[PDB]
Design a protein around this ligand. Structure first.
Ligand SMILES: CC(C)=CCC/C(C)=C/COP(=O)(O)OP(=O)(O)O
Ligand SMILES: [Mg+2]
Ligand SMILES: [Mg+2]
Ligand SMILES: [Mg+2]
Ligand SMILES: [Mg+2]
Lengths: 336, 317
């Protein structure tokens, strides 16, 4: 919605001022001005789906009579703390992957006189969201649960990143590690917690929903939606309309995992030889093998089956949680 | 630090590793939790844990003797290990920038908040403590960035080497997390929340922090291994050299400061000797010692002298 996008974007400039121009650290204006540019470059140029989903989650969890402009704005500020967390992770991930571009612009680490100083900027941006939480939430009962959620999700996302790294040795993929079990774990910890659980749990906390059973039931369905989301993303890297590099980078992708499940030994040897090679021909050989194993058809079947299984699980969701919130998320991801 | 203090502090470390690597929770990701255990084990508990043990000593000298139970001294130890987890994250980041993965520094920093939640979430000091770590982390990152703004394209920006910028770099990059953080944690655990008590403690500890780094900078060049000159660091020696230099002496700093050639390091050292930086350091060491001793003697707001005298005498030896 137009109103939601505009209300959300209007908050960002206030957060930059809160972090760089609140009359604090006035002895060091050169580093506060630089930090403004770090935030301005890395935080607000994406689709901001996670931050906006934090607002939508709150709007569907809170009692209608409690939805004031002021409370909706607080949900906006929590949304931007999610976008600050993501900004920090992607600054670091782009350095780790040595990627060229993110959101159509040169990766932050490639900018002049940054490189490995991107590590410090990563830590700085992540640290900044706790300053935003203190300013706007320190007087509310959801303060400590929200701080704890952000620290725990950061920890879990790091476990996800590190598990991803244990699928590679010396810039070569370990194909024996590419099991559906490990893939599912990587998706859960590396992406699902910060993408799906974090926005909804923030919505619940701001709506003073602290029942751990409610958070556990929410998590169960959001982890399942998370798995389809990443599997679809993995499928599109290879078979989407154009610039995917999963094959070249030797990533533990759903396609690589399913390919290795369905491969005869000669097909296996093509993966061993060619998966994660920098030569464009090697990328084409893996793509050709994926076509040969019928992965497009496999994905189409998984897309229909997973949709039906998740919708079934949403209907079984115990009273207290709005089914509409989870159906709305499914509708966003499946476009259906 | 006493033998009993060192041993009871060290006995906590294996508990923290098990808390962070989910031992007995039966995790779905044992391969990466076992790796993280090794990250903590290899990088956190080795050498002198001076910040960690200082947190315990600060607590013991701030708390009412009646409240110094084994249980409370152990909580001071865990707070100390949270400071050592922060120290370990900062060392890992320095190592990456010069087995460790790039995200290990973020992960180790993140882990201290898991430890604070586990052991302190029930205490009135919980929120002040986590807010202190948040603010110190932010300020440390600012210090690191300000240090980086003294270098461009691998060449030092000598116009940036002012005493004001130096003092700021030390305060933000080092002093907040090394000197203030241990004492503030001790105060919070002892239920000392008075902002004026934290402010008076902060004033003295920032002054001790400045001497610590100036002495460290002095010894890098004149100690009995040092690379500050080669790396083109914003050192107290470089700053004072530029204050004292005539134009011909400035031109030697421009030409030779931050060069990889060993000869360039010797030229800068010869200039430091010429400009009388040894004697200038000796004068500053005496004047700073007397000013800090005076501030400790004048310490009010019901703060104990002996904690600050002990910190001062440890750094000045
Ligand atoms: C601890 C850290 C730094 C976590 C990284 C989290 C993250 C979302 C990385 C992107 O993974 P990717 O490289 O598979 O995806 P993308 O295509 O977005 O780069
Ligand atoms: Mg990447
Ligand atoms: Mg990556
Ligand atoms: Mg992708
Ligand atoms: Mg040194």
């Amino acid at each position: 919605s137009k109103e939601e996008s505009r209300e959300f974007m209007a908050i960002f400039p206030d957060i930059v001022r809160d972090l760089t121009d609140a009359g604090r650290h006035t002895d060091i204006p050169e580093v506060t001005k630089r930090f403004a540019k770090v935030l301005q470059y890395n935080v607000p140029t994406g689709k901001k789906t996670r931050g906006l989903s934090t607002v939508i989650a709150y709007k569907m969890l809170e009692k209608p009579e409690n939805l004031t402009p002021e409370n909706v704005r607080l949900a906006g500020i929590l949304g931007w703390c999610v976008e600050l967390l993501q900004a920090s992770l992607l600054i670091m991930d782009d350095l780790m992957d040595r990627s060229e571009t993110r959101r159509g612009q040169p990766c932050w680490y490639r900018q002049e006189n940054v490189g490995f100083l991107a590590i410090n900027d990563c830590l700085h941006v992540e640290s900044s969201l706790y300053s935003v939480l203190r300013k706007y939430f320190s007087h509310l009962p959801c303060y400590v649960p929200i701080i704890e959620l952000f620290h725990d999700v950061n920890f879990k996302t790091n476990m996800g990143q590190s598990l991803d790294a244990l699928c590679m040795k010396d810039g070569r993929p370990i194909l024996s590690q590419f099991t559906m079990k490990r893939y599912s774990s990587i998706v859960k910890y590396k992406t699902s917690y910060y993408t799906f659980q974090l926005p909804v749990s923030l919505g619940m906390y701001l709506a003073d929903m602290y029942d751990p059973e409610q958070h556990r039931q929410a998590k169960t369905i959001l982890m399942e939606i998370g798995e389809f989301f990443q599997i679809q993303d993995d499928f599109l890297d290879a078979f989407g309309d154009s610039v995917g590099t999963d094959i070249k980078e030797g990533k533990c992708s759903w396609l690589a995992v399913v390919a290795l499940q369905r491969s005869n030994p000669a097909q296996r040897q093509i993966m061993e030889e060619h998966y994660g090679r920098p030569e464009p021909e090697s990328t084409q050989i893996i793509k050709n093998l994926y076509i040969e194993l019928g992965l497009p058809a496999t994905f189409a079947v998984y897309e229909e089956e997973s949709f039906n299984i998740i919708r079934t699980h949403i209907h079984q969701i115990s009273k207290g949680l709005p089914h509409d919130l989870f159906f709305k998320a499914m509708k966003k991801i499946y476009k259906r």
